[PDB]
Write a protein that binds this ligand. Structure first.
Ligand code: C4I
Ligand SMILES: *[C@@H]1O[C@H](CO[C@@H]2O[C@@H](C)[C@@H](O)[C@@H](O)[C@@H]2O)[C@@H](O[C@@H]2O[C@H](CO)[C@@H](O)[C@H](O)[C@H]2NC(C)=O)[C@H](O)[C@H]1NC(C)=O
Ligand SMILES: *[C@@H]1O[C@H](CO[C@@H]2O[C@@H](C)[C@@H](O)[C@@H](O)[C@@H]2O)[C@@H](O[C@@H]2O[C@H](CO)[C@@H](O)[C@H](O)[C@H]2NC(C)=O)[C@H](O)[C@H]1NC(C)=O
Ligand code: NAG
Ligand code: NAG
Ligand code: NAG
Ligand code: NAG
Ligand code: CL
Ligand code: CL
Ligand code: CL
Ligand code: CL
Ligand code: CL
Ligand code: CL
Ligand code: CL
Length: 527
């Protein structure tokens, strides 16, 4: 019976047998007043203390969200769907601490992705028990509100100021500061890490002054705020809020009366109508996301990045080899996970209309021009591979490289990786490569469990990544110093060295996607 006294009351954990040892898990600790009734759409409110023993022995409710139904019964998609009850009452977090209880352990705080519309910390691939067992760190993950319930925005209006899901995350970072020393954790050594919209979230905490004292260091997997999907404009946010109001029958003149109207709507009604607020949307559109609210985020983040207005500290940043392919089977013509998706030029052109809906003819032609200079004109997968690279370079690789250059230009150490190992257990087909989100299981050390079906080489790769991440969190340096590993060089804006992660040979390379990213970063933002 492991009981910890937090500042709001006593919580009860559970013991876990991991790798012939023990981890203590505290699953489902509340960290805010449930955002229900009059509290829906508002910022998270402080939690009033309890007097008993809160039983933190099972994952709590996931936040309300729409579910992927494109591949029913297929584990490749359904692994990302929530695995606890959906409920508005979902502001909970989890803590894994090593056994025996540590003295001043470094803390890793996970922020999941899901495009700010989906996700939950209870996913199997976010289980922080191996990190706690193997590296003696504490792992924390929290649920945060997503979609309109988390990011609906009437800027300046506190009834729906926007960015609520980010303030959920922040209130959880605060909880760690006030409480993690009781679990044996060092509040002075906190590393945020997340993937996709979670990585973008982490990058926004580097920008937000209200978060600057709540963490030490940052790790960004496949995401950053300067990605084109990561920030909703004040124009779009308002056009989307009124679109939702109209769809729900909540159109009013008093903008506050609109919110009160949306507060008598059942969560399901808000969920069904959320999808159509964006008229010409992309596959997996970020309908409701971070905005410049004037509170969490005081200016357009690109300007903050460009002008060095962010927390000075070390960053670890990286991307996967085929970030774009997962999105091609959610709308692109001729694509399918059950065949090899050989598409024609015309299919490629339609795909661009699908993924760049509001872009001019000339803009689309410019993308075609930059990506159809084939070495061989007869390789039938030419267009198929070009569409995936287009989506991956524009939405992930180039934004992440530009973040790392810009951030590093202000004097802090930065480390960039390129993950290029396709999991042997990967249920998606081979042509989709090293997909978006499929480094996460290696970061969390699932291949360390031999009872699974990972290869030995995959166990060694995960063990090395796990050590590098942990050495980065504890020491600001993502080396593996003991087993003759390749030294991870600092990423500098001139040389732009990065490290490749694979089962075979770990390599130092320079200037990832240089020719592609000059297009996306220096020409395409003009069109
Ligand atoms: O992620 C969203 N948007 C985007 C984010 C970032 C860059 C993007 C670039 C281009 C287009 C969209 C982008 C997004 C926008 C809306 C929604 C709400 N709805 C949920 C119900 C219907 C519908 C839907 O089926 N959503 C699938 C969600 C599962 N997802 C998966 C996850 C990952 N990898 C995957 C790989 C294989 C398959 C799936 C994956 C990486 C880690 C995060 C989760 C969208 C959700 C997600
Ligand atoms: C801003 O919003 C208007 C209105 O959105 C429409 O109504 C909502 C309830 C929802 O169902 C949306 O999907 C609708 O589009 C947009 O006006 C529409 O614009 C499209 C093309 O841009 C046009 O085909 C529709 O007929 C228009 N419908 C109406 C009612 O005006 C508008 O485009 C949105 N965006 C911008 C940039 O203005
Ligand atoms: C790959 O498959 C896509 C998707 O088609 C669906 O899934 C298949 C696995 C099979 O079960 C089909 O019956 C399904 O319709 C194919 O895209 C279709 O292509 C046909 C003819 O080219 C066209 O009439 C449909 O509109 C397309 N449907 C889409 C895009 O959703 C594609 O042709 C297949 N390609 C290869 C090389 O096998
Ligand atoms: C919490 O767990 C303990 C352990 O079995 C149990 O005795 C107690 O009744 C539980 N309390 C609640 C409120 O569920
Ligand atoms: C934990 O480490 C900090 C410095 O990082 C130190 O100031 C603090 O006293 C330590 N607390 C312990 C060892 O309990
Ligand atoms: C209507 O708007 C005013 C501000 O113009 C606001 O003070 C008032 O509270 C709103 N009405 C209701 C019922 O909230
Ligand atoms: C390094 O090698 C030792 C034995 O040679 C092994 O026990 C350990 O897990 C390895 N660690 C990493 C981080 O690769
Ligand atoms: Cl599960
Ligand atoms: Cl969608
Ligand atoms: Cl051709
Ligand atoms: Cl070098
Ligand atoms: Cl070079
Ligand atoms: Cl260069
Ligand atoms: Cl160019």
């Amino acid at each position: 019976d492991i009981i910890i006294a937090t500042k709001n009351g006593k919580v009860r954990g559970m013991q876990l047998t991991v790798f012939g040892g023990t981890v203590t898990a505290f699953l489902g600790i509340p960290y805010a007043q449930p955002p229900l009734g009059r509290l829906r759409f508002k910022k998270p409110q402080s939690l009033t203390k309890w007097s008993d023993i809160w039983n933190a022995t099972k994952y709590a409710n996931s936040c309300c969200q729409n579910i992927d139904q494109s591949f029913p019964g297929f584990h490749g998609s359904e692994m990302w769907n929530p695995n606890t009850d959906l409920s508005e009452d979902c502001l909970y977090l989890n803590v894994w601490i090593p056994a025996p209880k540590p003295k001043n352990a470094t803390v890793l705080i996970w922020i999941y992705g899901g495009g700010f519309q989906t996700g939950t910390s209870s996913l199997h691939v976010y289980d922080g028990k191996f990190l706690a067992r193997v590296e003696r760190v504490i792992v924390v993950s929290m649920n945060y509100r997503v979609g309109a319930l988390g990011f609906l925005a009437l800027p300046g209006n506190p009834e729906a100021p926007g960015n609520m899901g980010l303030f959920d995350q922040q209130l959880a970072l605060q909880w760690v500061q006030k409480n993690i020393a009781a679990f044996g954790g060092n509040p002075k050594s906190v590393t945020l890490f997340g993937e996709s919209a979670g990585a973008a979230s982490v990058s926004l905490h580097l920008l937000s002054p209200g978060s600057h004292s709540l963490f030490t260091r940052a790790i960004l997997q496949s995401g950053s705020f300067n990605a084109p999907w990561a920030v909703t404009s004040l124009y779009e946010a308002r056009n989307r809020t009124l679109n939702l109001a109209k769809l729900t029958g909540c159109s009013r003149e008093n903008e506050t009366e609109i919110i009160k109207c949306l507060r008598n709507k059942d969560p399901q009604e808000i969920l069904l109508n959320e999808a159509f607020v964006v008229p010409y949307g992309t596959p997996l559109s970020v309908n409701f996301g971070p905005t410049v609210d004037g509170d969490f985020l005081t200016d357009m983040p690109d300007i903050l990045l460009e002008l060095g207005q962010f927390k000075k500290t070390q960053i670890l940043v990286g991307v996967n080899k085929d970030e774009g392919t997962a999105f091609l089977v959610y709308g692109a013509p001729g694509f399918s996970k059950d065949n090899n998706s050989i598409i024609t030029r015309k299919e490629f052109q339609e795909g661009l209309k699908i993924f760049f809906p509001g872009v001019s003819e000339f803009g689309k032609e410019s993308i075609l021009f930059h990506y159809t200079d084939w070495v061989d004109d007869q390789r039938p997968e030419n267009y198929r591979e070009a569409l995936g690279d287009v989506v991956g370079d524009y939405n992930f690789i180039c934004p992440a490289l530009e973040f790392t250059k810009k951030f590093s230009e202000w004097g802090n150490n930065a480390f960039f990786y390129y993950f290029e190992h396709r999991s042997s257990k990967l249920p998606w087909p081979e042509w989709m490569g090293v997909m978006h989100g499929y480094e996460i299981e290696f970061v969390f050390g699932l291949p360390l469990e031999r009872r699974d079906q990972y290869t030995k080489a995959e166990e060694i790769l995960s063990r090395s990544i796990v050590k590098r991440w942990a050495n980065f969190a504890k020491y600001g340096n993502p080396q593996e110093t003991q087993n003759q590993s390749t030294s991870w060089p600092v990423f500098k804006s001139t040389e732009q060295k990065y490290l490749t992660l694979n089962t075979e040979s770990t390599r130092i390379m320079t200037k990832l996607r240089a020719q592609q990213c000059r297009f996306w970063t220096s020409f395409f933002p003009k069109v």
